[PDB]
């Protein structure tokens, strides 16, 4: 009944577990009653269409740390109750067909970090209304297109750090009304649209450190009425009068922020924007 490379047990949930067994393919004969399937740490290179189709009650599927080079668009057909899908640490994946997650209406945790992803294609996260945690860090993303997350009204954690994102457009984060933590550090972000955070009134943690920011428009942080933790260090901040709105916002912020180190002008290059006097930012 159980595949030779696996251990199968019924409690607490029906589980087929075969991690780190040197598998090059999804094993045949996984029990249709499986509720959890653990295939992490193998060398699986392809997930064909309907690889788990008979497992109608599946809620946990772990495929991380494999050698995935292709996931069929219909790989997850049948998995209408799937709640957790870990595809992370498959550095040669590179692309996920934008229909791959369609129909996963109970999905609440989706791991896609360390997958070599070059882009988030149109519709990739369509209709994932139950999604809570979305891990996209440590890929090769070079853009955050408008409306990429627009249906993710229940998302609370969005990790995007460790990519090559050069800017945040107006509607990148449209729809993210429940978002709690937004991790955007270690990117190439050179500007944030003034209204990029309009829907993030419930955000509590924002990381923007290790980017390419020299300034933030006056409006950017205004919508962040619940913010408690803010990291802005390791950016080339200019501390002249163009920094006055950020300075003023930081003076009134009731949470905790990182140092905001001045890069220029040289006479202030040894200072934290937060600690400057108002007279240092006069002029415009």
């Amino acid at each position: 009944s159980c595949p030779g490379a696996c251990v199968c047990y019924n409690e607490p949930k029906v589980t087929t577990s075969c991690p780190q067994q040197g598998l090059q393919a999804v094993p045949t004969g996984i029990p249709a009653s499986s509720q959890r399937i653990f295939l992490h740490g193998n060398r699986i290179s392809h997930v064909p269409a309907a690889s788990f189709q008979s497992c109608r009650n599946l809620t946990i599927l772990w495929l991380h740390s494999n050698a995935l080079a292709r996931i069929d668009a219909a790989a997850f057909t049948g998995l209408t109750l799937l709640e957790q899908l870990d595809l992370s640490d498959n550095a040669q994946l590179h692309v996920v067909d934008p229909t791959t997650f369609h129909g996963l209406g109970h999905l609440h945790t989706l791991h896609l970090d360390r997958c070599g992803l070059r882009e988030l294609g149109p519709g990739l996260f369509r209709g994932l209304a139950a999604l809570q945690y979305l891990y996209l860090q440590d890929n090769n993303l070079q853009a955050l297109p408008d409306n990429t997350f627009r249906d993710l009204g229940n998302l609370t954690h969005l990790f995007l750090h460790g990519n090559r994102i050069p800017s945040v457009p107006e509607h990148a984060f449209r729809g993210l009304h429940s978002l709690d933590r937004l991790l955007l550090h270690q990117n190439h972000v050179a500007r944030v649209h003034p209204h990029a955070f309009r829907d993030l009134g419930r955000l509590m943690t924002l990381y923007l450190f290790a980017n390419n920011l020299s300034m933030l428009p006056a409006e950017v942080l205004m919508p962040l009425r619940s913010l408690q933790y803010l990291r802005l260090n390791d950016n080339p901040w200019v501390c002249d009068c163009r920094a006055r709105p950020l300075w003023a916002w930081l003076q009134k912020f009731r949470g905790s922020s990182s140092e905001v180190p001045c890069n220029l002008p040289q006479r202030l290059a040894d200072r934290d924007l937060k600690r400057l006097a108002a007279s240092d930012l006069e002029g415009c």
Partner: protein
């Protein structure tokens, strides 16, 4: 005659187990500093 607690700090680490702290100044029974657990992310 305690003053209000400061906001909790940034997390000591953003990978794995870390802590935040907060402080308050007198004017008086109770602590002066507290810490609490934080975990932002798992890092390989």
């Amino acid at each position: 005659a305690w003053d209000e607690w400061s906001p909790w700090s940034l997390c000591s680490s953003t990978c794995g187990r870390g802590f935040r702290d907060r402080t308050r100044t007198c004017r008086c029974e109770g602590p002066e500093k507290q810490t609490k657990f934080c975990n932002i992310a798992l890092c390989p």
